Amino acid sequence: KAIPKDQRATTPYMTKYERARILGTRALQISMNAPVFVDLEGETDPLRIAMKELAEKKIPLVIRRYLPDGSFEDWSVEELIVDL
Amino acid sequence: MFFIKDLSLNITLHPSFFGPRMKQYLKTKLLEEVEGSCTGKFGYILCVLDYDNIDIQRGRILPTDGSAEFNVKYRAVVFKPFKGEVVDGTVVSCSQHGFEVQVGPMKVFVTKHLMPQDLTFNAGSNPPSYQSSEDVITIKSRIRVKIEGCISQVSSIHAIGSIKEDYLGAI
Amino acid sequence: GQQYSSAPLRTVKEVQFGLFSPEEVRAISVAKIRFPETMDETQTRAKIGGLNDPRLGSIDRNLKCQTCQEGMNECPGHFGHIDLAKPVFHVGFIAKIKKVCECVCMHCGKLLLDEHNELMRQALAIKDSKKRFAAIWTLCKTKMVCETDVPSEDDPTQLVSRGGCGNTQPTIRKDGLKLVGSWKKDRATGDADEPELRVLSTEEILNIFKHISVKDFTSLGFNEVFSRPEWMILTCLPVPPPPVRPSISFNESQRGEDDLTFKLADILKANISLETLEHNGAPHHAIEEAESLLQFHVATYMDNDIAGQPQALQKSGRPVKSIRARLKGKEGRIRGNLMGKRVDFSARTVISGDPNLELDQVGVPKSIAKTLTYPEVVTPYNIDRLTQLVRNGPNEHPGAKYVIRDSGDRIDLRYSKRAGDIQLQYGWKVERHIMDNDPVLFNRQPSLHKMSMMAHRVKVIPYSTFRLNLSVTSPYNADFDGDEMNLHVPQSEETRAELSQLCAVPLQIVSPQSNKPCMGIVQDTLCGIRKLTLRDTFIELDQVLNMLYWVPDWDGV
Amino acid sequence: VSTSTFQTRRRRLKKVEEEENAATLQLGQEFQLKQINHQGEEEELIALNLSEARLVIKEALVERRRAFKRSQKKTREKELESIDVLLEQTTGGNNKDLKNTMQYLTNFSRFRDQETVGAVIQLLKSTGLHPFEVAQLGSLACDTADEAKTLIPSLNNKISDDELERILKELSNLETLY
Amino acid sequence: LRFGEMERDCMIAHGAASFLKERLMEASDAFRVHICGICGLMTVIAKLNHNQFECKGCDNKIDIYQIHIPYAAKLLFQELMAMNITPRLYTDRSRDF
Amino acid sequence: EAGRAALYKEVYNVIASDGSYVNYRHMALLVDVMTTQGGLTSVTRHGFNRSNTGALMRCSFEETVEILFEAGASAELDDCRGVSENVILGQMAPIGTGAFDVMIDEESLVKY
Amino acid sequence: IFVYQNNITPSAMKLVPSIPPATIETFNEAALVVNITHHELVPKHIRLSSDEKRELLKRYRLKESQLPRIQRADPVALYLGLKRGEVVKIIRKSETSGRYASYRICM
Amino acid sequence: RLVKALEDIMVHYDNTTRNSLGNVIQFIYGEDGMDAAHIEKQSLDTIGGSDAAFEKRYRVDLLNTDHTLDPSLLESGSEILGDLKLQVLLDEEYKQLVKDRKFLREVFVDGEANWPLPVNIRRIIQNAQQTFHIDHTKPSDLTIKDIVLGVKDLQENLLVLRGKNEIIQNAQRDAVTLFCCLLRSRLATRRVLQEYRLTKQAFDWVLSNIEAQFLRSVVHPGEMVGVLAAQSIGEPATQMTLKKVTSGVPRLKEILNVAKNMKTPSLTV
DNA sequence: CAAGTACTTTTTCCGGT
RNA sequence: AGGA
DNA sequence: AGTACTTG
Ligand SMILES: Nc1ncnc2c1ncn2[C@@H]1O[C@H](COP(=O)(O)CP(=O)(O)OP(=O)(O)O)[C@@H](O)[C@H]1O
Ligand SMILES: [Mg+2]
Ligand SMILES: [Zn+2]
Ligand SMILES: [Zn+2]
Ligand SMILES: [Zn+2]
């Protein structure tokens, strides 16, 4: 159905699985010569660049957290706490 | 006829395009793929309306390749001809078999037999014409046709038409 | 590799199970399938317009498919068909067919009970098709008469007509592939003593099922769109293509046909006899003969291992491989080829312990690293490095095996006349050797643990064994009395992350199985750590300085 | 990949009925009267008379030329050449269909000005005729109520002959003297 | 080597969704079939070159999709069909929940 | 509920008899699974494998062909929600890494 | 409620669903000697109001299928006289959390 | 079978444990909503000993000249004497501790104190002690309000379930119960001052780290807890192979099979 | 009706009759 | 027939 | 070595 931003009840924290999937996706993208939203401070590994993008919180992705009924909450990698 | 229709193409963007000029490359890929297109289901997709308000939505990243898939929701001018539709057009082709009529994006071919009997072919004219006691149907001439049936054919739609009944024929 | 197709890519969301209507089989079919002969255009080696390819899939590997012009690796097979002379039971459905007959009128095709019986409308209520059919059967099996009129939903004095036909129902019993019933009869109130004993034909059960009401069969587990009862009886048979039953073609002049290809020809032969036998001089019994043989072949094709003992044995005594046999557990399609699979980018050797390896690394023998490849994309960040590994080639350690182009076509650096001058372009892929620090999945079978498969850092080393840190020994349950282990190389930037970010050895240290560390100091190090730490134990400067320099993180203090 | 619509039918296994399309106002599944805009709301069928459609496309490409030049920052015989120029500027060129269409509409339109197409759209959308008939009445020039009731046979019982003749008379006045 | 049933479990246990996919697809079996959107079967006569598609028996020349499945699953489905069962594959839902 | 209590107690005792320690939650979950149906659902082909999960999922243990035959007869619909169904289909299973979706937001992309 | 010593004739048993909307319950005296609800292993079951169930399902985004089930013949479902569809809230002590709330729908 | 029976079970984004049919198995994973690796055996002090020993450990009476906190324990010690308003707070505190103690004895019938719970409090305090160089001689700069209310606030922040409704909120309260019994027991006023000797600075740090640790300790929606449970029972069973009642592998076999005709049926009266 | 019967999943992954 |  | 099933 798609749950509104006010009314979102899932964790404000990013899941171990979310973080891994984001780093993977961005590494795969950077590696496919996608634009990088961070200064590569001499960086060359797309995974190492992905960590830097997630650290500077400059990853233009969104996690769609599906619920067992089918509904979902959308969360920006920007808004997700990284205590991981 | 000539309708305005709400349609939605799915586009698949390669990661190297995830720059700020994204919505722009997308809106264009839609226009490349969709405008000029001819489908049986919707007819000729002619002109994509309201460029400024084309809906890109959030695009899902497909797991193994980094590409993202977007459902580009849009609105366009279409042309889906029907049997029984009365159309006006200009003649183009003309032979012993009949004459073809250009109607917007599509041609309609009128059979020698789908015309009144009085109209006879004339090979010895420039360009080859169809002659009646009153009328002379030829290349640049304007004609009102009734579409008898159409054939959905790849990048086009073609139809067989009549000028035999009342109020049809030369204009 | 498969070629570009303009068809939209999508994923399977639902699997809609069902049965084939004969009409569908005929419709989907690319040919029927008249001659049991496989090919030889009268000895002339080329496929026949009769069995395997009267427009089906392709053989030869040379020479493309007729109907899709694709050829071998692209062409899924194409189905054909065999219009059976007489109907036959599907081996699988035999008991459901029986149970349905036991529930319905063997004459009018109406349910033996209805909305009028209390227990029946009670059973009809059940939402679960499987559980409701179970209930319907147990009530209806008993009812041995189709009722014309029954007591009304108010009083027994006035009885309402439910639906016609009075006929006594047979007491059906199976005699392996045949349904034979026993009608109680009536004769002067008595009979039975001695009831009517006659076998129920496929064709009669078909006609009763054909007459079962949509509402009626739908009250049984059935579905008017995907699975009608009549479809449990086979009329027109789908002939699977070569990809399903490939000919293991030894030499150039030798067939090597599949078991399925032979059993199909048996069916054809059994069918042809029956057809001519009835069309021609019909010696009445000689037909029920050839019919029962056709039933047998169509039975043993789908399932050879039937209760009713006679196994269809190949001329050699060895029995025929049924289709059911192909799908049966551990080894065979499901558990054998789908749940588990043999895989590329995998290596296996003897393991040995190394105190000089870090907990999270794995000693990878050079030879293994020079075989296992990772497909790296040509990017500006790596362009120069990759250009050098390609230059190095397949036999230098930091080297490459292939260069994959934009074109999709694979360059072999082992033979390509251009293996030297190979100018790399962004977006190409270089299949480079496995290198120090690449994450790899390490595993020791059994594999009863989350920790029996952990990700390690490559460490290319000499000698032919995989080297592992000693503390990592416990989660794997490994020892070095000759144990071997498996290595798996991820081919994606995405899968590599999964491994480093989730299954890495250090992540696995504390285990949820018992909420405590699953790795610790073991053997030599445990034995020596006690000895080193006694009150009695003092060390002189000379050694103290070496004991220090050895800690790679020592403050220099 | 090809285009899809707002109609969400689930033809599960059951293929057909492929019903014919006519002057029984029996158009496709797609060109049905009860349509649905992407906002989900039920909206009615939009059929355009040549004159109306000529303006729509012209308008669209005009504003597309605006957006293109914005993103590049950091007399019927004459209307024909004017249009052929705008097409070089906005459309992919490869679209021979649009050039052919615009030439056709430019040469076949009855109502040249926006205000003219306005009054046509008002006068007609009061009859209660299905947007297809309302378009054909606007795009085919008719004199007898018979001429119209013949070429648009669906009209047959829908309007009065005299009422249709009043309407045909107003449309004839509205014809922009090219 | 065999990435077996048990090994599949450890992968499921880790939550390595893509790594499991990769082992079972790209690193083994993986194949491309064309399926009909009306009867969810591999019926399609994909003459991918002349860009012709077709599913005679549905007369469908439009509603066709390409899917990526293990060749052994292509096999399983053809085997299930030879035995009269229909494993119809659909790229959209109809049940919700 | 006392069934769950007894069942757990007994399970725990087999584990603790060896001297081993398995954290509550693992045994709790097994016991909870056998329970939820309202009775004592055994961990056998004729027990759990006869529940209403996916036809393909169920055929992947013990009754294979027999299960699939029944699916075709009763026109069963596989949800494709189970792990095993995606494993068969060569699809990214809704497990860990696949339990949610990933999308590009154009707004944030043009913001950076 | 009808508390009987040894048996109830199948003649008399046919008159139990005879008077709806009113309801009847049979009970063997021998079973009633000990109150099972008093046992160590027996947690607090609580019958929910039609509005409470409505909320439980809304709050957990459930269909009635999805909840754990209690059999209509369960000693505790008998003690409380649970009817088909009626939901029980079970409150057990936890070595994990100290207090754990489960739910069971009636069969 | 254990694997095949539990394969499709995982923790969803509503902290709920469900199968491939979305049926609820457990309302919250392991009844507490905690990831197993983040748990450690911890002694619940409150649980045992004499009612007398408890009183000495937890009781603070600012209205009694003998049972106040000596002005050596904290700075306010002098001015805290006979303060009736504060004494209300310590009475709430004490009565809550006694409630806990009775409840714990209901759960752990045999008085077993050692239970695995998340957040090792003993370490946080130990670490605060070296981090801040705690002087076991000097008086603390803590208020009775600073401790009593401080603990009371942290409790509202140990979040497992997030929903804005009574149903979900009670689930949260319930799931967090036992942990808070430990929290209140290890963080009582008398204890913090007399035993730990913390400063306001150190106490604030202890409090933030409990919060932080607790949040890190919750299960991650995605966890295939079914397979994990199967393997976590299965693996040990393989390692036990590779009144004298049937036990080990064969009794486990008896169990999973729900075997009717069991080998050694026995009643304990 | 019961006894005694067949099947079945009956641990995993790695030279050649 | 062998291997952990 | 067990379980529903099957056949006497
Ligand atoms: N049939 C089998 N199937 C699966 N794993 C097996 C197996 N046989 C042996 N193993 C594995 O190999 C390990 C070693 O067994 P053995 O080679 O006999 C030496 P050990 O019994 O462990 O005693 P030791 O360490 O004091 O010498 C086992 O613990 C087990 O994991
Ligand atoms: Mg060994
Ligand atoms: Zn082919
Ligand atoms: Zn009858
Ligand atoms: Zn089809």
Largest sheet of chain D: 2 strands, antiparallel
What is the CATH C-level name of the largest domain in chain D? Mainly Alpha
Q: What is the strand arrangement across the widest sheet of chain D?
A: 1-2
Percent in helix of chain D: 40-55%
In which order are the strands of the major sheet of chain C placed?
10-18-11-17-16-19
PDB class: transcription
Keywords: transcription, transcription initiation
Entry title: RNA Polymerase II initial transcribing complex with a 5nt DNA-RNA hybrid and soaked with AMPCPP
Chain A: DNA-directed RNA polymerases I, II, and III subunit rpabc 2
Q: Can you put this structure into words, describing what you see?
A:
The structure is cut from a larger assembly and holds 1 copy of chain A (84 residues), 1 copy of chain B (171 residues), 3 copies of chain C, 1 copy of chain D (178 residues), 1 copy of chain E (97 residues) and 1 copy of chain G (107 residues). Chain A has a single domain (1-84), classed as Eukaryotic RPB6 RNA polymerase subunit. Chain A has 2 helices and 2 strands, in the order ααββ. Chain A has helices at residues 16-31, 46-55; strands at residues 61-66, 72-76. Chain A has a two-stranded antiparallel ribbon. Chain D is built from 7 helices and 3 strands, in the order E-E-E-H-H-H-H-H-H-H. Chain D has 2 domains: 1-47, no CATH class; 48-72 and 75-178, RNA Polymerase II, Rpb4 subunit (Growth Hormone, Chain: A, Up-down Bundle), CATH 1.20.1250. The radius of gyration of chain D is 19 Å and the shape is globular. Chain D has 178 residues and is mainly alpha-helical. In chain D, strands 1-2 form a two-stranded antiparallel sheet. In chain D, 50% of the residues lie in helices and 4% in strands. Chain E has a single domain (1-85), classed as DCoH-like (Alpha-Beta Complex), CATH 3.90.1800. With 97 residues, chain E is an alpha+beta fold. Chain E has a two-stranded antiparallel sheet with strand order 2-3. Chain E has 3 helices and 4 strands. The longest helix of chain E has 12 residues, at 71-82. Chain G has 107 residues and is of the alpha/beta class. Helix content of chain G is 21%, strand content 23%. Chain G is built from 4 helices and 6 strands, in the order βαβαβαβαββ. Chain G has helices spanning 10-13, 29-32, 50-59, 75-79, and strands spanning 2-4, 26-28, 44-47, 69-70, 87-92, 100-106. In chain G, the strands form 2 sheets. Chain G has a 4-stranded mixed beta sheet, with no helix packed on it. A two-stranded parallel sheet of chain G has the order 1-2. In chain G, strand 1, helix 1 (10-13) and strand 2 form a beta-alpha-beta unit. The two termini of chain G are 20 Å apart. The interface between A and F is medium-sized, with 21 and 15 residues. One zinc ion binds next to loops of chain E. Chain C binds 3 DNA and RNA strands through residues 307, 329-330, 348, 443-448, 477-479, 481-484, 486. The PDB classes it as transcription. The entry lists the keywords transcription, transcription initiation. The entry is titled "RNA Polymerase II initial transcribing complex with a 5nt DNA-RNA hybrid and soaked with AMPCPP".
